[PDB]
Design a protein around this ligand. Structure first.
Ligand SMILES: Cc1cc2c(cc1C)N(C[C@H](O)[C@H](O)[C@H](O)COP(=O)(O)OP(=O)(O)OC[C@H]1O[C@@H](n3cnc4c(N)ncnc43)[C@H](O)[C@@H]1O)c1[nH]c(=O)[nH]c(=O)c1N2
Ligand SMILES: Cc1cc2c(cc1C)N(C[C@H](O)[C@H](O)[C@H](O)COP(=O)(O)OP(=O)(O)OC[C@H]1O[C@@H](n3cnc4c(N)ncnc43)[C@H](O)[C@@H]1O)c1[nH]c(=O)[nH]c(=O)c1N2
Ligand SMILES: O=c1ccn([C@@H]2O[C@H](COP(=O)(O)OP(=O)(O)O[C@H]3O[C@H](CO)[C@H](O)[C@H](O)[C@H]3O)[C@@H](O)[C@H]2O)c(=O)[nH]1
Ligand SMILES: O=c1ccn([C@@H]2O[C@H](COP(=O)(O)OP(=O)(O)O)[C@@H](O)[C@H]2O)c(=O)[nH]1
Lengths: 374, 383
């Protein structure tokens, strides 16, 4: 028996689950409220300059999971790329993440790796900060950017989210540690378009999900936000949102893909020069984005989930409501209130599809979550 | 018919020429005077640390030649590797080659690209029409300050001559970059063989018709036993050095071991004329996909190549070219031999270029059997 499957969202979670089940003969309907595919991975060529623009912010693919890598390489041509981020602060330019060049340049030293460790220990001694990393360093790259990014003081408990960056005592300046890293040649929209290209998948855009639909389907995969599915009945989960002031420059505006600004007294958080994500292409005109962080309010796009104490308690109420549902599975960053990379999203969507396909063969019930959230 | 073929040397020239011929039936005999294969691309693991050491200098593979890239991908697993060189000078650490980061750190600014062009244009002297020396090239395009900080001391160490005595071409190959890219090489294909260049050359050498004899010098009486000789030893040596030795710079690699990360990168240049080594290399960073606790490191020193040193860099100025002409003039009088490779032709040649020339040289000698014509002594220009 082919099942009727509804999928809310056509980003990676939707697309990849949809393709896995379509391939096994199920009848898949995917909807999305936006006028185009790809969720926040979506990109498109600006018309004036023809630069592939990453519409919802710089998107770099990286993973240690060889299955996912192989999986995307069937849908795109991955071009080698390494993300090398720069930062402007105190009238100097630095490489990020904080590596031995940063340390030496910042303190005007010629330290070796070990000498650097000895230097940092003694400079160390908001709270993770002053013990490990010292006054002068704390204030320079971390205080100000935090404040601008999260929107609460650094005097409000860290010890998670800044630990997605690594802290090296070598001159490696690759933002990631992952084994695989690249940039699709024709962009993530075509890679997603290729994942959606199957006869058993029907896609409708500008189509909002409505609870009244549920009963026309055997199962629903929902990758929209968990609080909205329930009418926000216990309150709205906390999200930071982003504004992007776009502009055009005839030239190379900054000389790299991403320049961060660490001083608080600068309004934007970073500027991104989109053509630097396509080194294999040449462009005279340049599309650029100044990027501003705010509190998310009911009209904005939710970007990063805050996950401080309060939002966790509030999340737990929606989790326990979701636990009593029957033909639905919630997935993705928005469905589970988690900050997820593309590689982890794709990994979770393949697994979700496999558990479902397994549930039909073994005649068992499909879980509401396929990943840990509680 | 199958031909009898002597190949002198077992680096890329030997291996590649000799594999193309074993593929067309020929009886290839490859000799090398050293007790291992690989020529100056030879790497080997250090006993105590297990780090893969590039024994004759760091060797990084890079090319725009897809055909060559394919070919070595047949004989090794090529790992992605981007050479990112650092430099220590004037009490600081910089990135090389000169880029927007080096410029902004050196002059203490936060220039954009277009502002850096304007900064360097004011420093350069656009009154020099056609820079002929290394010095003139640097004063024209980067200015006195950058010149003296990053190039003068270094060039003196490397070449044993003032930069006003050295050709502009040497520096022409490194234009200033006005963005933040610090990859050393502009090339499209770039990497490092996972099992190292020895295993790679071993693979090239692993064919039915090929026998390799190591610790075996060439002897002139061997010619007679073969239909043709491919020679990639030094040209002056073949002729007994009878006119003099071709000029070379040599290198001393001074080994030491550290328990940990000694410098934190593969390559660190010392640009001051007053630090005696040109650089320090830390070989494990050439294998970043591996993990090692102990590190093999080298300090490199450059000096004139003497009678018993290994020749690394050809000098190639008038006198040396005069001398070369004397050996060319009698190489031109040989009948069943072809000089190839960096040593055979007194040129510096990267790996990809060397491999391309070997493919060409094998092609040419097959092309010339089907046409019963004479195989020339060089398959490349040398005059
Ligand atoms: C600023 C920024 C920058 C980056 C990244 C995130 C952010 C916020 N990411 C993370 C990456 O964007 C993320 O993993 C993927 O977007 C997850 O894709 P999903 O399909 O799960 O959700 P995604 O959010 O993309 O898709 C949800 C889709 O469902 C639709 N939808 C929602 N509610 C609906 C409703 N009720 N009815 C109908 N449709 C609805 C939406 O329109 C949307 O299209 C990233 N990752 C990475 O690996 N490298 C990177 O560099 C970056 N860069
Ligand atoms: C310091 C330094 C650093 C580098 C490089 C060169 C130098 C000097 N190279 C260049 C690279 O080394 C060069 O391309 C190859 O070694 C060429 O190999 P050949 O086989 O042509 O000569 P090669 O010199 O390697 O081999 C000649 C062989 O002939 C043997 N021989 C000589 N006389 C003999 C005799 N009479 N009898 C028997 N055997 C004899 C020798 O023992 C030797 O094995 C390089 N290239 C690159 O692409 N990337 C890089 O990073 C570097 N790095
Ligand atoms: O200069 C910085 C940068 C980060 N942070 C802290 O560390 C976190 C870093 O998180 P991310 O860089 O991952 O934030 P983004 O999601 O916006 O970055 C996204 O865009 C980047 C483009 O360079 C990468 O692709 C990255 O992997 C992708 O998550 C920040 O939120 C902030 O808490 C700072 O204090 N200073
Ligand atoms: O820090 C440096 C690096 C290189 N060079 C000069 O540039 C030349 C080219 O050097 P490179 O290492 O780039 O290429 P290769 O030595 O392999 O030909 C050297 O001989 C030097 O004279 C320099 O002056 N300072």
């Amino acid at each position: 028996k082919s099942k009727k499957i509804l999928i809310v969202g056509a980003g990676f979670s939707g697309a990849v689950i949809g393709r896995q089940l379509a391939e096994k003969g199920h009848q898949v309907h995917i909807i999305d409220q936006r006028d185009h595919i790809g969720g926040n991975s979506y990109d498109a060529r600006d018309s004036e300059t023809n630069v592939m623009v990453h519409v919802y912010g710089p998107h770099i693919f990286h993973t240690d999971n060889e299955t996912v890598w192989n999986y995307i390489n069937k849908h795109a041509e991955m071009m080698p790329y390494v993300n090398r981020v720069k930062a402007t602060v105190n009238g100097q330019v630095f490489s990020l993440p904080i590596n031995l060049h940063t340390i030496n340049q910042f303190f005007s030293k010629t330290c070796s790796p070990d000498e650097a460790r000895a230097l940092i220990a003694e400079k160390g001694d908001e709270e993770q900060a002053l013990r490990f990393i010292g006054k002068e360093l704390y204030e320079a790259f971390f205080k100000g950017y935090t404040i601008k990014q999260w929107g609460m003081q650094p005097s409000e408990l860290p010890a998670s989210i800044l630990k997605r960056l690594p802290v090296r005592f070598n001159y490696d300046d690759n933002y990631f540690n992952h084994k695989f890293q690249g940039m699709p040649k024709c962009g993530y929209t075509q890679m997603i378009k290729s994942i959606l290209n199957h006869e058993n998948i029907k896609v409708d855009l500008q189509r909002e999900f409505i609870v009244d639909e549920r009963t026309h389907y055997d199962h629903v995969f929902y990758s929209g936000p968990l609080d909205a599915f329930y009418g926000y009945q216990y309150g709205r989960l906390g999200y930071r949102t982003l504004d992007f002031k776009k502009f055009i420059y005839q030239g190379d505006y900054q000389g790299c893909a991403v320049m961060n600004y660490c001083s608080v007294d600068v309004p934007y958080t970073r500027i991104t020069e989109h053509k630097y994500f396509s080194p294999w292409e040449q462009h005279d005109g340049s599309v650029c984005y100044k990027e501003y962080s705010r509190a998310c309010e009911e009209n904005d796009i939710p970007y990063y989930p805050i996950r401080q104490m309060g939002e966790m308690a509030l999340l737990e109420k929606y989790l326990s409501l979701a636990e009593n549902e029957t033909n639905i599975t919630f997935v993705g960053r928005l469905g589970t209130y988690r900050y997820l990379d593309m590689d982890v999203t794709i990994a979770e969507a393949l697994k979700t599809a496999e558990v479902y396909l397994n549930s039909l063969t073994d005649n068992q019930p499909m879980p509401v979550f396929t990943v840990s959230v509680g």
